[PDB]
Amino acid sequence: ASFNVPIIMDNGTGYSKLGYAGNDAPSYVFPTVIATRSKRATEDLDFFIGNDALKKASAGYSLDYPIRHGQIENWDHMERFWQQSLFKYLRCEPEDHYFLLTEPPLNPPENRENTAEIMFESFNCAGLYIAVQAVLALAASWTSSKVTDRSLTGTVVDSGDGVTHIIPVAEGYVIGSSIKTMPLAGRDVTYFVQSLLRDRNEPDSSLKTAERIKEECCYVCPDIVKEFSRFDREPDRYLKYASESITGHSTTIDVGFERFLAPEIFFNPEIASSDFLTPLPELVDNVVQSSPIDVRKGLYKNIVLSGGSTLFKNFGNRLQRDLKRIVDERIHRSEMLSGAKSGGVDVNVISHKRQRNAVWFGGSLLAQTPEFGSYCHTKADYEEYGASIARRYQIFGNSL
Amino acid sequence: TFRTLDVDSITEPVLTEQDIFPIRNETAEQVQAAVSQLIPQARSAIQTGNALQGLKTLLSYVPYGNDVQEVRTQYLNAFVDVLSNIRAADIPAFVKECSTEEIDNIVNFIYRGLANPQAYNSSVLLNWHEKVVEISGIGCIVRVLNSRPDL
């Protein structure tokens, strides 16, 4: 492999985190959005991305998010997003560098195939590793890079903008049969905040204002009928949020029960959706109880949080208490049949200083390894087998 | 692991092409002599400018077999050389006077010619294909699809 630093690109549904292996942060963290125009033809040169795309809606560009619900679904826009990432922001030559890419555990064979042909034929990268994204978020949880600080067994709950998935990993191996996914994350709680501002007919219900009300005003409560009652009993529970309009004037928004009812989307997904029903503490139980019996203590002892939509105030404490309730009720059913007390299991949900970008920090830490260039597809593999080299699922069991 | 071991190839032997098509009732040197008598007539008919009679005589017998590629390719060299020397205005009058079996042999050997363009001129074989299919219909190609694999 080349001696140049690998380039790390976590392309999320909400945000892309771009940087180089071994740095103390991503070089860029900006929305996974493209601004596109809607006698020589140049409208495919005229686009913008990230923070510079958000500035272009008033100039008549159509904004789009080429990743939705965790999966790339517009390969024209994702190719233009990557070329602009590589040549504007990272300012790099693909021929000199190995790349770490990411996508959700479910992601189609078709997506890794389409990713490999853009990377090896459009850009001609030296080599590509498409990582299992929340497996990197386990490695970001270490107290330091030294081997004695590693905890190679843990459940990881990743919750970004587009999807939340719970991954069991034990001794560094991903138990792919036990992956659970909930199709609801940080964007669906924004659409719920937006919908509640809109039901009150508030002066502003733009998407940025609903987003900023999540980041600043929202938190996870114990129980929504007790918390609705606390919003009768105590008057300063309602906040006032000052927002500036697209046409440049002030507004003031009263923010109310969406402060607790919007983060409740994870703990009662029947608020968000007709199609998904199991709450996150029961969904994490289903991951560990489908997983092999000898790893269950290790998977409960280390439940790592990952992705921006896990950062709600009191989120890890609600998950820990509700999962500890599920776990001890199941252990006590067995103690009451057997007539003897167990040792129990400690359920620990872990929030940590790198939790916001744990996939990128893990990708950086794993791409720093001396062995890394041997796990990549090299362009010499792609010259023989084409994009079919990337098609086989890494995380799940394959037939053949 | 067991999944990849081919058991079917030894426990259930499949039909061979000679179970579908009857065996050739002539030896390799017997057919090689029969074609070696015809190729000189086919060459000679070009020199007298009677290439139409060159085809009518060459077409009176056809070699077949997986044991006879050398004489099959010599017969195909003579066939494409004969078809290349017939004038394009003579083709409609000749095709309508061929039997269904002579037509079947013409459309079979223009197909063997079209399979190897570095040896054979496709432009004359496609001109012959247009006129033979126009006059005798689609069923002559259907007889080539259905034909023996060692023609």
Partner: protein, 192 residues
């Protein structure tokens, strides 16, 4: 593929979809070739909602968890290797009679091509583990899967036979008068 079926009512919908569209691949690298090189495996299914879903490799990839249990997280051997390890544990004098009558039963035996795959995969497993890859004796190994049309109901149809064989033999059944004096020890009649 982005579809969702998490409602308790939708489990019967994918049961009917599986039961209509799934089949057992006879040759995995061939079905993977038809799957990855071709669109011929693609099929449309209409849900009782009226929604239409597209299904392709999942048609052979779903029932493959019977022949490869690791696909559903199980460490057990699949159908062919579970049946082979069972017959190959029987005494030498009876192994032939067990291979000459491998009787399939129950609805999950009904996938298209399952008898064909099972017979092949037992011949193929005897060729690996008994002949060590020597072709010369493989034609002499006889296996016969019994694969009757009625076999989804063979337990009922056989229960209706056995219940007639013991209908007049009133002592063969555990009695209410025997249950109320012995309790659960009345069931010790029902074999070892």
């Amino acid at each position: 593929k982005g579809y969702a079926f998490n409602r308790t009512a939708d489990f019967e919908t994918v049961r009917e979809m599986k039961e209509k569209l799934c089949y057992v691949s006879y040759d995995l690298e061939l079905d993977h070739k038809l799957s990855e090189e071709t669109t011929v495996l693609m099929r449309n299914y209409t849900l009782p909602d009226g929604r239409v879903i597209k299904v392709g490799s999942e048609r052979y990839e779903c029932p493959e968890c019977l022949f490869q249990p690791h696909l559903v997280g199980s460490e057990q051997p699949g159908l062919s290797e579970f049946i082979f390890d069972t017959i190959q544990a029987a005494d030498v004098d009876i192994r032939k009679y067990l291979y000459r009558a491998i009787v399939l039963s129950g609805g999950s035996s009904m996938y298209a091509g399952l008898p064909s795959r099972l017979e092949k995969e037992i011949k193929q497993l005897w060729f690996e583990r008994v002949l060590h890859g020597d072709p010369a004796r493989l034609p002499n190994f006889k296996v016969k899967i019994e694969d009757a049309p009625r076999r989804r109901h063979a337990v009922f149809i056989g229960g209706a036979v056995l219940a007639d064989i013991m209908a007049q033999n009133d002592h063969m059944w555990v009695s209410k008068a025997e249950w109320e004096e012995y309790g659960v020890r009345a069931l010790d009649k029902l074999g070892p």
